[PDB]
Amino acid sequence: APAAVDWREKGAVTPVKDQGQCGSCWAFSTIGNIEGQWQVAGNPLVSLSEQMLVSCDTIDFGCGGGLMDNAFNWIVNSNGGNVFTEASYPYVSGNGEQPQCQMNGHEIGAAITDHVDLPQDEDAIAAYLAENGPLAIAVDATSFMDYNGGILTSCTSEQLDHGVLLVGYNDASNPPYWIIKNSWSNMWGEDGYIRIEKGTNQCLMNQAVSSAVVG
Numbered sequence: 001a002p003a004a005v006d007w008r009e010k011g012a013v014t015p016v017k018d019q020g021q022c023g024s025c026w027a028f029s030t031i032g033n034i035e036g037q038w039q040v041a042g043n044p045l046v047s048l049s050e051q052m053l054v055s056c057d058t059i060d061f062g063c064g065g066g067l068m069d070n071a072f073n074w075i076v077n078s079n080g081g082n083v084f085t086e087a088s089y090p091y092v093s094g095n096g097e098q099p100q101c102q103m104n105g106h107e108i109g110a111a112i113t114d115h116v117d118l119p120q121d122e123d124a125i126a127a128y129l130a131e132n133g134p135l136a137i138a139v140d141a142t143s144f145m146d147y148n149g150g151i152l153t154s155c156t157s158e159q160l161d162h163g164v165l166l167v168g169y170n171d172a173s174n175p176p177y178w179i180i181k182n183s184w185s186n187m188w189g190e191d192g193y194i195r196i197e198k199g200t201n202q203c204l205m206n207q208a209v210s211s212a213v214v215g
């Protein structure tokens, strides 16, 4: 594995979005992973629609939450692997509420076929992240609330409550660390991002790692 990766540089990362007062982090993590897997599949990097999932995902609970795996299933089983652009289906549940699903009028910006679950091991993950790009992961976010910058090495790691996106890492560093993109706008952490210690299962990060599949 490389000493450090960061798919933000490779241009696989859309800007930091805001999920608002709605429990749709599961939908951001999902979309962000599909954003990066589609880019890294050699396409124009494009912003995909989180509102699609929030309003239309019948396997999940919209603004009440969900699982990244179940979004991946619903996009395949229910939407023929199709994903609408942000542009054509903009995010509107920012202040907590859940508009009805509208299937028409939007434009497809990305397609998928399957998803995969990755091992609860950290070098393993580092090995998939660096070969494939941003990975949908779930975290204990308890210590994200008080986060203000730098490398978190004393994270509460007792329960998975939050979907986020893993975009890079760095072993050359003391301690080594992961780069994670959040959905709490660029006014939080380090312009939207948080760095946590790598190699201790910080915030239980290796527990629920997944990614969609393109082509």
Ligand SMILES: COc1ccc2c(c1)C(=O)N[C@H](C(=O)NC1(C#N)CC1)Cc1ccc(c(Cl)c1)OCCCCO2
Binding pocket: 022, 023, 024, 025, 026, 059, 060, 061, 063, 064, 065, 066, 067, 068, 069, 070, 138, 160, 161, 162, 163, 208
């Ligand atoms: C289909 O709806 C479900 C079903 C089971 C759920 C969860 C949602 C769940 O608790 N999801 C977390 C979540 O939705 N967090 C919110 C935020 N921000 C809405 C509160 C975000 C989340 C939390 C934990 C997690 C995953 Cl993959 C996602 O790993 C699985 C741990 C137990 C599964 O908990």
